[PDB]
Structures are given as structure tokens and as C-alpha cells.
């Protein structure tokens, strides 16, 4: 009963802030968004934009997903994002992450009625 959409919002939406406040952003939020529960999730991106703005990407530039499906969409304009990559070590259950900030075009897979993001495919 956790939806694809809700999982996407949870794993990748942080409308709260406008960027990664510190360099302890990833460590703190990977934990709070349940991405360190069963293992250390190796990589995750967070997006600092309204849910409406990210949702509207589902009708922006249609592009191929990395898997060969056709339901991926690239944002016309750049967005504030935060990449979390696990440091060399870092051992579960003390998951440690490099927190990288940038302004990039996001790529998301959208599905459903209504048609919303369910997967973060890439940033460029």
C-alpha cells in the first residue's frame, strides 16, 4: 500500500529546501527517508523543487529510459538536485555519503492515471 508515486516522492522529493544546506545532507536524509533500513542504498538523488514542477516533467521532453522503455521524461530547465554516493567506507548500519549539489536537468519515468513520476532515471 506504499504507491510507486509515494515511494518516488519519499526517495527523491525534498521540496522543503532550495539546496543541500550542509555537506551532511545526504547522511541525514538517506536515514530519515528509509534508504538505510535494509542496506546502505548505494546512490540516490534528491530534487529541490515543487512537487508540481517535478510532476510537470511528465509532459516535457520524452526520452528513452536507460532500460529501453519509452516512458522517460527530461526537464526542459535545470533543477536544484543533490546526489548522494556512498563513501568507500561507510559500513552498514552506519551509512556514509558524499553530498554533491548541482543544477541539472532531471530524467524521470512516469506512469499511471494520473501520469506521475515513479522512478528517477538520470540527471544531465
PDB file of C-alpha atoms in Angstrom:
ATOM      1  CA  UNK A   1       0.000   0.000   0.000  1.00  0.00           C
ATOM      2  CA  UNK A   2       3.006   2.381  -0.454  1.00  0.00           C
ATOM      3  CA  UNK A   3       2.440   3.561  -4.035  1.00  0.00           C
ATOM      4  CA  UNK A   4       5.067   3.906  -6.757  1.00  0.00           C
ATOM      5  CA  UNK A   5       4.402   7.639  -6.597  1.00  0.00           C
ATOM      6  CA  UNK A   6       4.775   7.833  -2.826  1.00  0.00           C
ATOM      7  CA  UNK A   7       7.969   5.851  -2.944  1.00  0.00           C
ATOM      8  CA  UNK A   8       9.224   8.305  -5.604  1.00  0.00           C
ATOM      9  CA  UNK A   9       8.258  11.345  -3.529  1.00  0.00           C
ATOM     10  CA  UNK A  10       9.938   9.708  -0.471  1.00  0.00           C
ATOM     11  CA  UNK A  11      13.134   8.658  -2.221  1.00  0.00           C
ATOM     12  CA  UNK A  12      13.596  11.829  -4.397  1.00  0.00           C
ATOM     13  CA  UNK A  13      11.431  14.839  -3.490  1.00  0.00           C
ATOM     14  CA  UNK A  14      12.699  17.353  -0.923  1.00  0.00           C
ATOM     15  CA  UNK A  15      10.593  20.429  -1.621  1.00  0.00           C
ATOM     16  CA  UNK A  16      11.492  21.576   1.925  1.00  0.00           C
ATOM     17  CA  UNK A  17      14.811  23.149   0.941  1.00  0.00           C
ATOM     18  CA  UNK A  18      16.232  25.004  -2.082  1.00  0.00           C
ATOM     19  CA  UNK A  19      19.555  23.105  -1.923  1.00  0.00           C
ATOM     20  CA  UNK A  20      21.740  20.800   0.197  1.00  0.00           C
ATOM     21  CA  UNK A  21      22.065  23.033   3.295  1.00  0.00           C
ATOM     22  CA  UNK A  22      25.311  21.425   4.537  1.00  0.00           C
ATOM     23  CA  UNK A  23      27.564  18.537   3.471  1.00  0.00           C
ATOM     24  CA  UNK A  24      25.767  16.281   5.982  1.00  0.00           C
ATOM     25  CA  UNK A  25      22.525  16.487   3.919  1.00  0.00           C
ATOM     26  CA  UNK A  26      22.762  13.004   2.425  1.00  0.00           C
ATOM     27  CA  UNK A  27      23.710  11.184   5.658  1.00  0.00           C
ATOM     28  CA  UNK A  28      20.789  12.801   7.468  1.00  0.00           C
ATOM     29  CA  UNK A  29      18.121  12.293   4.789  1.00  0.00           C
ATOM     30  CA  UNK A  30      19.054   8.862   3.450  1.00  0.00           C
ATOM     31  CA  UNK A  31      18.400   7.797   7.042  1.00  0.00           C
ATOM     32  CA  UNK A  32      15.093   9.691   7.535  1.00  0.00           C
ATOM     33  CA  UNK A  33      13.698   8.627   4.113  1.00  0.00           C
ATOM     34  CA  UNK A  34      14.308   4.942   4.959  1.00  0.00           C
ATOM     35  CA  UNK A  35      17.074   4.434   2.397  1.00  0.00           C
ATOM     36  CA  UNK A  36      19.438   2.903   5.011  1.00  0.00           C
ATOM     37  CA  UNK A  37      16.898   0.412   6.530  1.00  0.00           C
ATOM     38  CA  UNK A  38      17.875  -2.959   4.974  1.00  0.00           C
ATOM     39  CA  UNK A  39      21.201  -1.862   3.453  1.00  0.00           C
ATOM     40  CA  UNK A  40      23.117   1.265   2.507  1.00  0.00           C
ATOM     41  CA  UNK A  41      21.396   2.357  -0.758  1.00  0.00           C
ATOM     42  CA  UNK A  42      24.495   2.984  -2.898  1.00  0.00           C
ATOM     43  CA  UNK A  43      23.222   6.121  -4.777  1.00  0.00           C
ATOM     44  CA  UNK A  44      20.236   8.431  -4.577  1.00  0.00           C
ATOM     45  CA  UNK A  45      19.286  11.801  -5.966  1.00  0.00           C
ATOM     46  CA  UNK A  46      17.087  14.372  -4.261  1.00  0.00           C
ATOM     47  CA  UNK A  47      15.278  17.212  -6.090  1.00  0.00           C
ATOM     48  CA  UNK A  48      14.616  20.644  -4.577  1.00  0.00           C
ATOM     49  CA  UNK A  49      11.590  21.777  -6.481  1.00  0.00           C
ATOM     50  CA  UNK A  50       7.862  21.856  -6.014  1.00  0.00           C
ATOM     51  CA  UNK A  51       6.049  18.546  -6.437  1.00  0.00           C
ATOM     52  CA  UNK A  52       4.029  20.340  -9.183  1.00  0.00           C
ATOM     53  CA  UNK A  53       7.216  21.291 -11.015  1.00  0.00           C
ATOM     54  CA  UNK A  54       8.679  17.777 -10.848  1.00  0.00           C
ATOM     55  CA  UNK A  55       5.252  16.316 -11.775  1.00  0.00           C
ATOM     56  CA  UNK A  56       5.024  18.560 -14.827  1.00  0.00           C
ATOM     57  CA  UNK A  57       8.195  16.853 -16.182  1.00  0.00           C
ATOM     58  CA  UNK A  58       5.868  14.002 -17.155  1.00  0.00           C
ATOM     59  CA  UNK A  59       4.732  16.193 -20.083  1.00  0.00           C
ATOM     60  CA  UNK A  60       8.147  17.612 -21.010  1.00  0.00           C
ATOM     61  CA  UNK A  61      10.923  16.102 -23.219  1.00  0.00           C
ATOM     62  CA  UNK A  62      10.187  12.452 -23.912  1.00  0.00           C
ATOM     63  CA  UNK A  63      13.410  10.438 -23.948  1.00  0.00           C
ATOM     64  CA  UNK A  64      14.471   6.848 -23.764  1.00  0.00           C
ATOM     65  CA  UNK A  65      14.908   5.350 -20.309  1.00  0.00           C
ATOM     66  CA  UNK A  66      18.112   3.596 -19.539  1.00  0.00           C
ATOM     67  CA  UNK A  67      16.254   0.262 -19.684  1.00  0.00           C
ATOM     68  CA  UNK A  68      14.838   0.782 -23.182  1.00  0.00           C
ATOM     69  CA  UNK A  69      11.326   1.761 -22.164  1.00  0.00           C
ATOM     70  CA  UNK A  70       9.857   4.908 -23.642  1.00  0.00           C
ATOM     71  CA  UNK A  71       8.159   6.495 -20.693  1.00  0.00           C
ATOM     72  CA  UNK A  72      11.104   8.709 -19.572  1.00  0.00           C
ATOM     73  CA  UNK A  73      10.978  12.492 -19.494  1.00  0.00           C
ATOM     74  CA  UNK A  74      13.675  15.135 -19.317  1.00  0.00           C
ATOM     75  CA  UNK A  75      13.054  18.505 -17.644  1.00  0.00           C
ATOM     76  CA  UNK A  76      13.236  21.495 -20.024  1.00  0.00           C
ATOM     77  CA  UNK A  77      15.067  23.594 -17.471  1.00  0.00           C
ATOM     78  CA  UNK A  78      17.663  22.686 -14.892  1.00  0.00           C
ATOM     79  CA  UNK A  79      16.622  21.978 -11.327  1.00  0.00           C
ATOM     80  CA  UNK A  80      18.420  22.015  -7.971  1.00  0.00           C
ATOM     81  CA  UNK A  81      19.401  18.434  -7.152  1.00  0.00           C
ATOM     82  CA  UNK A  82      21.547  16.605  -4.580  1.00  0.00           C
ATOM     83  CA  UNK A  83      23.487  13.389  -5.434  1.00  0.00           C
ATOM     84  CA  UNK A  84      24.301  11.008  -2.536  1.00  0.00           C
ATOM     85  CA  UNK A  85      27.092   8.481  -3.245  1.00  0.00           C
ATOM     86  CA  UNK A  86      28.297   6.108  -0.518  1.00  0.00           C
ATOM     87  CA  UNK A  87      31.927   6.764   0.568  1.00  0.00           C
ATOM     88  CA  UNK A  88      34.415   3.901   0.068  1.00  0.00           C
ATOM     89  CA  UNK A  89      33.502   3.019   3.668  1.00  0.00           C
ATOM     90  CA  UNK A  90      30.935   3.667   5.330  1.00  0.00           C
ATOM     91  CA  UNK A  91      29.668   0.295   6.623  1.00  0.00           C
ATOM     92  CA  UNK A  92      26.049  -0.649   7.325  1.00  0.00           C
ATOM     93  CA  UNK A  93      24.424   0.221   9.684  1.00  0.00           C
ATOM     94  CA  UNK A  94      26.471   3.460   9.662  1.00  0.00           C
ATOM     95  CA  UNK A  95      25.899   4.539   6.078  1.00  0.00           C
ATOM     96  CA  UNK A  96      28.057   7.448   4.927  1.00  0.00           C
ATOM     97  CA  UNK A  97      27.551   9.529   1.793  1.00  0.00           C
ATOM     98  CA  UNK A  98      29.299  12.179  -0.296  1.00  0.00           C
ATOM     99  CA  UNK A  99      26.717  15.035  -0.679  1.00  0.00           C
ATOM    100  CA  UNK A 100      27.054  16.660  -4.184  1.00  0.00           C
ATOM    101  CA  UNK A 101      24.942  19.703  -5.235  1.00  0.00           C
ATOM    102  CA  UNK A 102      24.270  20.857  -8.814  1.00  0.00           C
ATOM    103  CA  UNK A 103      21.764  22.390 -11.155  1.00  0.00           C
ATOM    104  CA  UNK A 104      20.807  19.744 -13.695  1.00  0.00           C
ATOM    105  CA  UNK A 105      18.084  18.538 -15.981  1.00  0.00           C
ATOM    106  CA  UNK A 106      16.361  15.562 -14.356  1.00  0.00           C
ATOM    107  CA  UNK A 107      15.048  12.445 -16.175  1.00  0.00           C
ATOM    108  CA  UNK A 108      12.136  10.548 -14.620  1.00  0.00           C
ATOM    109  CA  UNK A 109       9.962   7.562 -15.674  1.00  0.00           C
ATOM    110  CA  UNK A 110       6.244   8.401 -15.460  1.00  0.00           C
ATOM    111  CA  UNK A 111       3.306   6.019 -15.197  1.00  0.00           C
ATOM    112  CA  UNK A 112      -0.324   5.933 -14.186  1.00  0.00           C
ATOM    113  CA  UNK A 113      -3.614   7.721 -14.346  1.00  0.00           C
ATOM    114  CA  UNK A 114      -2.794  10.421 -13.390  1.00  0.00           C
ATOM    115  CA  UNK A 115       0.617  10.214 -15.082  1.00  0.00           C
ATOM    116  CA  UNK A 116       3.239  10.919 -12.430  1.00  0.00           C
ATOM    117  CA  UNK A 117       6.858  10.127 -11.728  1.00  0.00           C
ATOM    118  CA  UNK A 118       7.646   6.734 -10.330  1.00  0.00           C
ATOM    119  CA  UNK A 119      11.412   6.398 -10.917  1.00  0.00           C
ATOM    120  CA  UNK A 120      14.448   8.692 -11.158  1.00  0.00           C
ATOM    121  CA  UNK A 121      16.368   7.620 -14.233  1.00  0.00           C
ATOM    122  CA  UNK A 122      19.186  10.145 -14.573  1.00  0.00           C
ATOM    123  CA  UNK A 123      20.356  13.726 -14.421  1.00  0.00           C
ATOM    124  CA  UNK A 124      22.121  15.601 -17.207  1.00  0.00           C
TER     125      UNK A 124
END
